[PDB]
């Protein structure tokens, strides 16, 4: 949908996991929708959540993911 766009992740979910946990990562930088930075994720066992790009556990899991 491209009429009214809000953040790809309006909030974040503060649950530290490991790259083996997370099978999809998508990094959304401040858009014309939301002037913030948002990490979208899918954990294979672990659902598809929103992540805090500022949180160090993520920094690893995403870094080591990519």
């Amino acid at each position: 949908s491209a009429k009214e766009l809000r953040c790809q992740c309006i909030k974040t979910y503060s649950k530290p996991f490991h790259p083996k946990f997370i099978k999809e990562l998508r990094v959304i930088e401040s858009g014309p929708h939301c002037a913030n930075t948002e990490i979208i994720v899918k954990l294979s066992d672990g659902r598809e959540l929103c992540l805090d790009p500022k949180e160090n556990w993520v920094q690893r899991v995403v870094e080591k993911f990519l």
């Binding site: 309006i10 530290p16 996991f17 959540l49 899991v61």
Partner: peptide, 29 residues
């Protein structure tokens, strides 16, 4: 796989600690 960039040093290993995951909270649309 990746590629591109230049300069660096240090880094690598996966995980972290404290906390955990699954559970609930998160959302968007």
């Amino acid at each position: 796989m990746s590629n591109i960039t230049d300069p660096q040093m240090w880094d690598f290993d996966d995980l972290n600690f404290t906390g955990m995951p699954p559970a609930d909270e998160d959302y968007s649309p």
